[PDB]
């Protein structure tokens, strides 16, 4: 592979490096093998990244897996979509996937507190949902001339 790297006089150049690529994955162990750079090792298994290097690093992998897919088809989506997703998938600290009366009974017994900010719940209740134009209240300005 080609690697752009800065040069002695400051500009970026190409500098090839050999790389190895595997079928199959043993990151904990391969990382340790003498002669490789352990700081740059990669895998497309973002689970193993998280297991070895932690939730952050897996979040960064996962992003990079999703971005791969989306640029492999040749299209482009703003950072501000895929990061959100990826945060959603990693804010409990692990990688969480994103993929009636009966239920009410359980609420009951659980004492579920419904925050009321969804749009269905609000429908039910005859209300706007606190989204968008519903996220603030409007009142009459008794303080004006």
């Amino acid at each position: 592979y080609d690697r752009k790297v800065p040069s002695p006089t400051g500009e970026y150049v190409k500098e090839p490096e050999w790389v190895l690529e595997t079928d199959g994955v043993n990151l904990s162990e391969v990382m340790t093998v003498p002669g490789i750079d352990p700081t740059r090792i990669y895998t497309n298994s973002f689970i193993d990244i998280m297991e070895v290097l932690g939730i952050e690093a897996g979040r960064a992998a996962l992003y990079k897996e999703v971005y791969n897919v989306i640029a492999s088809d040749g299209s482009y989506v703003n950072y501000r979509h895929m990061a959100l997703l990826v945060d959603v998938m990693t804010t409990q600290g692990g990688l969480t996937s994103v993929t009636t009366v009966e239920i009410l009974f359980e609420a009951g017994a659980s004492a579920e507190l419904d925050d009321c900010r969804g749009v269905s719940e609000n429908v039910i209740l005859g209300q706007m949902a606190p989204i968008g134009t519903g996220a603030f209240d409007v009142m009459i300005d008794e303080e004006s001339l």
């Binding site: 749009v119 609000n122 429908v123 005859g126 209300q127 706007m128 949902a129 606190p130 989204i131 968008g132 134009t133 519903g134």
Partner: protein
């Protein structure tokens, strides 16, 4: 009932591309050939190169010669028929041989800078038409607003519409409520 073609109806050649009629023009307004021949249909060139439907194009050359010559034109697959041949034949018969012709704009009569591929092609009227397909239900006494449509409007942020739209007509009953026990237990 008789159905006369109209804006809306669908048509196809036999090369796996359809279209609806987008407007009609009477013949004065169409573009025309020195001979005075005018098209019965006008299709857009942007429909061609991606679909790589060169058989359309070849059928229309082949069909010109047929009609000029009164022979059936043999369009079966796997023969010796070739465009070069066909274009030969059509030059013998006095037209440019890849099927272009000069034509003249209708509205003004001036010639067209560009010439135009012009020929018969067999087109089919397909079933199923703007009249059967239009409906329009808004009461007195697809076509829906489903999960995904909701989602686009939450996207845009449109809460009031989302409440209007998804309500009941089911009247707003009013109710007293304890503010310690939230229940509707209250004696009013």
């Amino acid at each position: 009932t008789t159905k006369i073609p109209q804006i809306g109806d669908k048509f196809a050649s036999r090369h796996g591309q359809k279209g609806t009629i987008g407007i009609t023009y009477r013949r004065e307004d169409m573009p025309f050939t020195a001979e005075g021949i005018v098209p019965d249909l006008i299709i857009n060139p942007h429909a061609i190169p991606s679909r790589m439907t060169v058989a359309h194009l070849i059928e229309c050359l082949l069909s010109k010669v047929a009609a000029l010559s009164g022979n059936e034109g043999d369009a079966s697959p796997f023969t010796d028929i070739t465009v070069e041949g066909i274009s030969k034949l059509l030059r013998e018969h006095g037209y440019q041989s890849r099927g272009f012709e000069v034509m003249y704009n209708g509205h003004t009569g001036k010639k067209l800078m560009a010439q135009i591929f012009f020929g018969p092609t067999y087109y089919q009227r397909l079933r199923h038409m703007v009249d059967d397909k239009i409906h329009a239900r808004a009461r007195g006494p697809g076509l829906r607003f489903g999960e995904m449509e909701r989602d686009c409007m939450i996207a845009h942020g449109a809460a009031s519409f989302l409440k209007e739209r998804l309500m009941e007509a089911s009247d707003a009953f009013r109710v007293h409520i304890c503010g310690i026990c939230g229940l509707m237990t209250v004696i009013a």
